[PDB]
Design an enzyme around this catalytic site. Structure first.
Site, PDB file in Angstrom:
ATOM      1  CG  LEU A  41      -2.279  -0.690   1.031  1.00 33.42           C
ATOM      2  CD1 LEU A  41      -3.008  -0.788   2.363  1.00 33.42           C
ATOM      3  CD2 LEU A  41      -3.130   0.024  -0.004  1.00 33.42           C
ATOM      4  CB  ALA A  51      10.307   8.190   7.306  1.00 32.28           C
ATOM      5  CG  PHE A  52       7.177   6.120  10.303  1.00 30.78           C
ATOM      6  CD1 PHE A  52       7.956   6.246  11.449  1.00 30.78           C
ATOM      7  CD2 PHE A  52       6.561   7.253   9.784  1.00 30.78           C
ATOM      8  CE1 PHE A  52       8.116   7.478  12.072  1.00 30.78           C
ATOM      9  CE2 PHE A  52       6.713   8.491  10.403  1.00 30.78           C
ATOM     10  CZ  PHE A  52       7.492   8.603  11.549  1.00 30.78           C
ATOM     11  N   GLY A  53       8.793   2.644   7.204  1.00 31.51           N
ATOM     12  CA  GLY A  53       8.758   1.333   6.565  1.00 31.51           C
ATOM     13  C   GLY A  53       7.598   1.124   5.603  1.00 31.51           C
ATOM     14  N   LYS A  54       7.466  -0.118   5.146  1.00 33.12           N
ATOM     15  CA  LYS A  54       6.450  -0.492   4.177  1.00 33.12           C
ATOM     16  C   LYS A  54       5.132  -0.790   4.877  1.00 33.12           C
ATOM     17  CB  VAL A  55       1.730   0.409   4.693  1.00 31.73           C
ATOM     18  CG1 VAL A  55       0.355  -0.037   5.177  1.00 31.73           C
ATOM     19  CG2 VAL A  55       2.291   1.496   5.607  1.00 31.73           C
ATOM     20  CE  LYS A  66       4.612   0.938   9.214  1.00 34.18           C
ATOM     21  CG  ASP A  74       0.649  13.100  12.523  1.00 26.81           C
ATOM     22  OD1 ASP A  74       0.814  14.245  12.032  1.00 26.81           O
ATOM     23  OD2 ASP A  74       1.193  12.082  12.035  1.00 26.81           O
TER      24      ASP A  74
HETATM   25  C1  274 Z   1      -6.373   2.667  -0.241  1.00 24.82           C
HETATM   26  C2  274 Z   1      -5.577   3.049   0.835  1.00 24.82           C
HETATM   27  N1  274 Z   1      -5.442   2.483   2.030  1.00 24.82           N
HETATM   28  C3  274 Z   1      -4.572   3.155   2.802  1.00 24.82           C
HETATM   29  C4  274 Z   1      -4.109   2.947   4.106  1.00 24.82           C
HETATM   30  C5  274 Z   1      -4.776   2.225   5.101  1.00 24.82           C
HETATM   31  C6  274 Z   1      -5.847   1.349   4.983  1.00 24.82           C
HETATM   32  O1  274 Z   1      -6.440   1.014   3.961  1.00 24.82           O
HETATM   33  N2  274 Z   1      -6.168   0.882   6.173  1.00 24.82           N
HETATM   34  C7  274 Z   1      -5.358   1.417   7.087  1.00 24.82           C
HETATM   35  C8  274 Z   1      -5.302   1.255   8.461  1.00 24.82           C
HETATM   36  C9  274 Z   1      -4.351   1.933   9.202  1.00 24.82           C
HETATM   37  C10 274 Z   1      -3.442   2.774   8.571  1.00 24.82           C
HETATM   38  S1  274 Z   1      -2.223   3.604   9.524  1.00 24.82           S
HETATM   39  O2  274 Z   1      -1.921   4.940   8.900  1.00 24.82           O
HETATM   40  O3  274 Z   1      -2.704   3.780  10.923  1.00 24.82           O
HETATM   41  N3  274 Z   1      -0.780   2.709   9.382  1.00 24.82           N
HETATM   42  C11 274 Z   1       0.349   3.284   8.633  1.00 24.82           C
HETATM   43  C12 274 Z   1      -0.613   1.471   9.899  1.00 24.82           C
HETATM   44  C13 274 Z   1      -0.978   0.320   9.187  1.00 24.82           C
HETATM   45  C14 274 Z   1      -0.799  -0.943   9.749  1.00 24.82           C
HETATM   46  C15 274 Z   1      -0.231  -1.061  11.016  1.00 24.82           C
HETATM   47  C16 274 Z   1       0.140   0.088  11.708  1.00 24.82           C
HETATM   48 CL1  274 Z   1       0.834   0.001  13.283  1.00 24.82          CL
HETATM   49  C17 274 Z   1      -0.041   1.343  11.155  1.00 24.82           C
HETATM   50  C18 274 Z   1      -3.493   2.936   7.190  1.00 24.82           C
HETATM   51  C19 274 Z   1      -4.457   2.265   6.451  1.00 24.82           C
HETATM   52  C20 274 Z   1      -4.115   4.235   2.045  1.00 24.82           C
HETATM   53  C21 274 Z   1      -3.104   5.311   2.477  1.00 24.82           C
HETATM   54  C22 274 Z   1      -4.745   4.172   0.814  1.00 24.82           C
HETATM   55  C23 274 Z   1      -4.531   5.174  -0.341  1.00 24.82           C
HETATM   56  O4  274 Z   1      -4.933   6.332  -0.245  1.00 24.82           O
HETATM   57  N4  274 Z   1      -3.797   4.796  -1.393  1.00 24.82           N
HETATM   58  C24 274 Z   1      -3.273   3.409  -1.450  1.00 24.82           C
HETATM   59  C25 274 Z   1      -3.539   2.850  -2.845  1.00 24.82           C
HETATM   60  N5  274 Z   1      -2.885   3.722  -3.832  1.00 24.82           N
HETATM   61  C26 274 Z   1      -3.004   3.091  -5.156  1.00 24.82           C
HETATM   62  C27 274 Z   1      -3.611   5.004  -3.865  1.00 24.82           C
HETATM   63  C28 274 Z   1      -3.512   5.725  -2.516  1.00 24.82           C
END
Ligand code: 274
Ligand code: 274
Ligand code: CA
Ligand code: CA
Ligand code: CA
Ligand code: CA
Ligand code: CA
Ligand code: CA
Ligand code: CA
Ligand code: CA
Ligand code: CA
Ligand code: CA
Ligand code: CA
Ligand code: CA
Ligand code: CA
Ligand code: CA
Lengths: 285, 285
Positions: free
Chosen positions: A18, A22-26, A41, A129
């Site tokens: 996704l 700076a905080f790695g891959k999602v 993560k 944030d």
């Molecule tokens: C489609 C989509 N999904 C996401 C991110 C998600 C998501 O779908 N679910 C979700 C849950 C939590 C988080 S978070 O920010 O809290 N995070 C970083 C995190 C995640 C997991 C574990 C931990 Cl500890 C922390 C981040 C996310 C994003 C940024 C996008 C997006 O705009 N895009 C993505 C697709 N692209 C093609 C277009 C833009």
């Protein structure tokens, strides 16, 4: 909340990426049993930051906050699975559509954000944030507040100055800002800026570099909408009281839920429409 | 700076107790080789606070700051030996003599404290816990600034929020107070209060409980001497500029070393006399 006994790669499969930074891959993950999708993560002694984050997430069971699906420590890697939000981040939506949100769309985001913040603040959790990039969308047109990393790094510190008679005034004030009822006010200011970001695509002071931006926030009058005549008096009044430089007199989320910019918002339809339009836009090739 | 290879109980002997409290016992130790005396802590994962403290102490080699004699980790106990100051703490001296310091005595303490703070601030070390109880005396009539526990706990944090555009003004200010040139100003305020404590035995607001004291510091005008006519215009002016509620306009130690309250102080004789009088008083039975 961190499962030790279960092996995670028997329950989840990493099927995509996704993001990165700076905080790695999602990662994007798929439940091999149920087919549910997660943001993931998989993290290989700053795991205590992630531990505090998991605890916050597990505590933050609410409709407009991201839902923790699972956390594991196995072979080692720390796995953290969170609900997938197929609508994406609101800042990605604005970039994809090449425009800001309409006022009806902003009203829904604001109402739902206020409900979320009222909940968090009840639990003495400060997000710290807020920004459009941390407001995620569902296909139904609901938000989910995301990214409790800053929240968790801050909380780890507080969970972990001077002697009062000799303490400087500025030290007293900044230690007093670390606690109730001042700590949570920060999120109300950041909400106001986020609403401007959604109206105008960019936050105030976007033209200045980050270090100059800090001086500008401290010394400048509160930000206002660039083209006031586009927006309701209600929106401009809402911003006027939320963007109070004095945290003592800045309203709570509970107080702001009674403001007429949001007090009559009972439908998410404008946001459901936005997400549909973004989806359709993304499909263009 | 923490010696692992040497066993400490072959070099030092614990021959007495100097104090006790919330941070454990402080021992009096004697060097079995040289006969030198030390204040000692023998401490059985908050040892990282003590590790950072040792590093500060080792960096703070200066005539008016306590001198680290040795730090060990053996069998696991953390040993920390620091130079013994036979004159004791200035607050103990005032209690023993049942009076405050004379202005000539205060002038010497102030001059020497300013030299120490100018040194620390050059090293970007902020004490953050100045008070008469942390100003220790030698038989020669020199001070030693002591107790870098608060300093170290603060530094461990900084060594270990938000995104700037969305950051609340009060958050910007308190993060900006964590760095140069604002961080070190806190010590200048605390110096002023310490000088009042030395003049009057008790600091300002001593009658109020600690939580009320914090509100009082934030909201009240800066403290002044209770009986101005006892004190020189120079002392009252010194306090006037040091006890500036605005850290931006509060002078540095370097600037204050040119103030006429201290700029002509070239002898420690008043303080040597004080320590002699305290010693003689202690001998009474
Ligand atoms: C489609 C989509 N999904 C996401 C991110 C998600 C998501 O779908 N679910 C979700 C849950 C939590 C988080 S978070 O920010 O809290 N995070 C970083 C995190 C995640 C997991 C574990 C931990 Cl500890 C922390 C981040 C996310 C994003 C940024 C996008 C997006 O705009 N895009 C993505 C697709 N692209 C093609 C277009 C833009
Ligand atoms: C005589 C005397 N000595 C001391 C304390 C000393 C001292 O002599 N040397 C010294 C060095 C450092 C420190 S410290 O505050 O920095 N500290 C607590 C510490 C020490 C060791 C290691 C570490 Cl990490 C930290 C504290 C001290 C005190 C408080 C007194 C005193 O007034 N009194 C004592 C005798 N009484 C009969 C009268 C009052
Ligand atoms: Ca849910
Ligand atoms: Ca596009
Ligand atoms: Ca994100
Ligand atoms: Ca941008
Ligand atoms: Ca309206
Ligand atoms: Ca189209
Ligand atoms: Ca298009
Ligand atoms: Ca020395
Ligand atoms: Ca006595
Ligand atoms: Ca002490
Ligand atoms: Ca007292
Ligand atoms: Ca004088
Ligand atoms: Ca006598
Ligand atoms: Ca007597």
């Amino acid at each position: 909340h961190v499962r030790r006994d279960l092996d995670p790669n028997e329950v989840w499969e990493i099927v995509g990426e996704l993001g990165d930074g700076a905080f790695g891959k999602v990662y994007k993950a798929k439940n091999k049993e149920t087919g549910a999708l997660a943001a993931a993560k998989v993290i290989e002694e700053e795991l205590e930051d992630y531990i505090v984050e998991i605890e916050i997430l597990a505590t933050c069971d609410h409709p407009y906050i991201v839902k923790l699906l699972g956390a594991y420590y196995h072979d080692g890697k720390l796995w953290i699975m969170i609900e997938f939000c197929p609508g994406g981040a609101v800042d990605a939506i604005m970039l994809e559509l090449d425009r800001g949100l309409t006022e009806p769309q902003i009203q829904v985001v604001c109402r739902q954000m206020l409900e979320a913040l009222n909940f968090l603040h009840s639990k003495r959790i400060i997000h710290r944030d807020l920004k459009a990039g941390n407001v995620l969308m569902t296909l139904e047109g609901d938000i989910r507040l995301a990214d409790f990393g800053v929240s968790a790094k801050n909380l780890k510190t507080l969970q972990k100055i001077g002697t009062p008679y000799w303490m400087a005034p500025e030290v007293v004030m900044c230690e007093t800002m670390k606690d109730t009822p001042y700590d949570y006010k920060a999120d109300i200011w950041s909400l106001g800026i986020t609403l401007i970001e959604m109206a105008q695509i960019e936050p105030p002071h976007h033209e200045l570099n980050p270090m100059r931006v800090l001086l500008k926030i401290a010394k400048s009058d509160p930000p206002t909408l660039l083209t006031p005549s586009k927006w309701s008096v209600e929106f401009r009044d809402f911003l006027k009281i939320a963007l109070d430089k004095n945290p003592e007199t800045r309203p709570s989320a509970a107080q702001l839920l009674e403001h007429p910019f949001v007090s009559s918002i009972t439908s998410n339809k404008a946001l459901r429409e936005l997400v549909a339009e973004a989806k359709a836009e993304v499909m263009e090739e």
